[PDB]
């Protein structure tokens, strides 16, 4: 079983006070807090083992290089990639999507082709493909939404055709909490010889993830939402695709040879896509993050979070004029608006109670447009959140409605 | 005055033992050690103040956003940029050069144009321009070297012409320690209407740097060589150039509006070049790094390092068959080879004494080719290094020559 009290004891931020009152951090979907196991792992690496990696033969450099590639191996096992050489270190989901869109997109998407995204995508999974479609002269098609925050799956027959090069789709919606039927969609996209990039930024922290079972071609997530440091993320690519992709960033540690008269040659995959000094501090911290999350066990986290989510949805039923967005089985987040009050105002009042929720468009303006609102509130319910905090959210919304209605 | 003993007391790694023996870290040019002021600043941010930045109205998010943009202001003052809005956060020198090469290069370098780099450049300042010249059909010209590791400045008349769009030049050579006459070269390049990108990865830690006085158009350096965290760096661009450059990475926090039917619009400069979640942990640590280096005072560091360098060059005179590369007034590093022994072997013996030096090509293969060697040894002498450690280097080379000659 899961003991949220013991978990919270690992997170020094959770003892913080905001505005005189004790913090209720309900915004892990924007970024997650970090346990001192993660913070100290990075700190102790800087304190005792720091060196440049890959180049260099001295001891610290060799031991730091070992640490880095061990984290690549642990990450590849976390998402059940066949090989650690299928994982590329990136700054996060957004750089990972940009890397695919340039390295792979530019050499596999011709004028007259089409790419499919969905109306619920984060901006990280829209703007790169808009840029690619503009560069090559292709069309960006959109899987539309149902009122309940699920995909209109019946539109796929009209979006997919022989010219469909790529489907880029989210695993879990950072706003609605919808989880998309990735296995079956990837089957369909593969029947047309299309690849699938999966945005898994909001999945990898809520339940186990198996990229061999999904058969996705690319998968991306971010360290800082997995209870880890900022400035680090993972891009997974099928070995056969990755070996064919050209470099994106150029510089040191991705060349084989540099000549000013006979040109330059690239090293083999993963390392060909990693230019300059890696974020070694971030990688070490991400590795601790994977160790920490695996020790609690994702299936235990999934259960605790599923029960907290149920408790919340049940309690919110007693908030007047509350509008929820998204499906009943949402993961991680609750998207809502309070009567006719603007979300910015509702969020301000909740922050005044010391409750941190997200407000605005959540880098998903097309989703806001579909629901014909400018903004929503989003509350995250993560493995370190409590029924007590759910109650403070509910009371607070009640008080806001009384005060402002 | 400078007190290297008190400085070293800030650096927990310097107490490390390697191979049973006490560490002599002579490889800060590859990456620098970090003081606990830097390590703890990042750690305390994760521990007490962590949130997502820019989006969000709650307290932690607003205070984290303040911290981030204050570091942008402190960085802009460190290099004497006119405006903090002229600085872009990047992963380091290599991403910063790639950003200019794509965002600015692709829209200002046409087929038939030429770009000038130098033979002493790091790979970060070669491979991006080779990629750009291949994309657009331009020519990469090279300022050649003199035997002493300085530029053959008399070749500039034949390299510069009306078609010269850009000079990309290093401030200090990561290998030879040469410092290039940037002020005068930028004058010349500006007379032809060419812009200058300066690679300052090896300058900003050795003496003050003033981008208004240099009149450079772009400048780049890396956090981890400035006694700071990995995964963070600064790209400086003149306000007028930066406002004209198009985005590079696309995603959240660089849009103004995202529409799936009317396209997307970009936000204003700096922020248009920063997609997704920033490396907030890195930025906080870089900010502490700038605070720490400014407290010692760059001119004090420059003096201590200049005297240590003189002491070393003087002592190395008593090493038989030692070949040095580079000018007499080198900054930061000493590049050498021991008799006919391969640098990898010499570095292995020094690491066995617990002395960490760099060996190989130092991501500067064209420089190795000019000196008709495959590799060199490089020893860094930074503000926390001692005359005692110089002696261990000298003794060690002597012992290596006796043993292996
Ligand atoms: Cl290299
Ligand atoms: Cl956005």
Swiss-Prot record, chains A, B:
Cofactor dependence: pyridoxal 5'-phosphate
Result of altering residue 363 to A: Abolishes activity towards L-cysteine but not towards selenocysteine
The entry's keywords: Cytoplasm, Hydrolase, Lyase, Pyridoxal phosphate, Transferase
Gene Ontology MF term list: cysteine desulfurase activity; cysteine sulfinate desulfinase activity; hydrolase activity; protein homodimerization activity; pyridoxal phosphate binding; selenocysteine lyase activity
InterPro entries: Aminotrans_V_dom, Aminotrans_V_PyrdxlP_BS, Cys_dSase_SufS, PyrdxlP-dep_Trfase, PyrdxlP-dep_Trfase_major, PyrdxlP-dep_Trfase_small
Pathway: Cofactor biosynthesis; iron-sulfur cluster biosynthesis
Positions where N6-(pyridoxal phosphate)lysine occurs in the chain: 225
Function statement: Cysteine desulfurases mobilize the sulfur from L-cysteine to yield L-alanine, an essential step in sulfur metabolism for biosynthesis of a variety of sulfur-containing biomolecules. Component of the suf operon, which is activated and required under specific conditions such as oxidative stress and iron limitation. Acts as a potent selenocysteine lyase in vitro, that mobilizes selenium from L-selenocysteine. Selenocysteine lyase activity is however unsure in vivo. Can also desulfinate L-cysteine sulfinate (3-sulfino-L-alanine).
Family statement drawn from the similarity comment of this UniProt entry: Belongs to the class-V pyridoxal-phosphate-dependent aminotransferase family. Csd subfamily.
PANTHER family: CYSTEINE DESULFURASE
Name of the molecule in the record: Cysteine desulfurase
Record organism: Escherichia coli (strain K12)
């Amino acid at each position: 079983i899961f003991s949220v009290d013991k978990v919270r004891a690992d997170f020094p931020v959770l003892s913080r006070e905001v505005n005189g009152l004790p913090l209720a951090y309900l915004d892990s979907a924007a970024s997650a807090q970090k346990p001192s196991q993660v913070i100290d792992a990075e700190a102790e690496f800087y304190r005792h083992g720091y060196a440049a990696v890959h180049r260099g033969i001295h001891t610290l450099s060799a031991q730091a290089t070992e640490k880095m590639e061990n984290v690549r191996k642990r990450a590849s096992l976390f998402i059940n990639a066949r090989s650690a050489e299928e994982l590329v270190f990136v700054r996060g989901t957004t750089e990972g999507i940009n890397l695919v869109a340039n390295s792979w997109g530019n050499s596999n998407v011709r004028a007259g082709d089409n790419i499919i995204i969905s109306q619920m995508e984060h901006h990280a999974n829209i703007v790169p493909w808009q840029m690619l479609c503009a560069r090559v002269g292709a069309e960006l098609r959109v899987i539309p939404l149902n009122p309940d925050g699920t995909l209109q799956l019946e539109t796929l027959p009209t979006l997919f055709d022989e010219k469909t090069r790529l489907l880029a789709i989210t695993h879990v919606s950072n706003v609605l909490g919808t989880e998309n039927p990735l296995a079956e969609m990837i089957t369909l996209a593969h029947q047309h010889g299309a690849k699938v990039l999966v945005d898994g930024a909001q999945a990898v922290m809520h339940h186990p993830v198996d990229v061999q079972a999904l058969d996705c071609d690319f998968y991306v997530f971010s360290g800082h939402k997995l209870y880890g440091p900022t400035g680090i993320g993972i891009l997974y690519v099928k070995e056969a695709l990755l070996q064919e992709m050209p470099p994106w960033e150029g510089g040191g540690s991705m060349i084989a040879t540099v000549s000013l008269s006979e040109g330059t040659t690239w090293t083999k995959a993963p390392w060909r896509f990693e230019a300059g000094t890696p974020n070694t501090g971030g990688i070490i911290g991400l590795g601790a993050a994977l160790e920490y999350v695996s020790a609690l066990g994702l299936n235990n986290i999934a259960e605790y979070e599923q029960n907290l989510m149920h408790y919340a949805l049940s309690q919110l039923e007693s908030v007047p004029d509350l509008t929820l967005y998204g499906p009943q089985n949402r993961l991680g987040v609750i998207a809502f608006n309070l009567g006719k009050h603007h979300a910015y105002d509702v969020g301000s009042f909740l922050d005044n109670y010391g409750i941190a929720v997200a407000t605005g468009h959540h880098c998903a303006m097309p989703l806001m447009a579909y629901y014909n609102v400018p903004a929503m509130c989003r509350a995250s319910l993560a493995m370190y959140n409590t029924h007590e905090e759910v109650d403070r959210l509910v009371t607070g919304l009640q008080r806001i409605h009384r005060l402002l209605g």
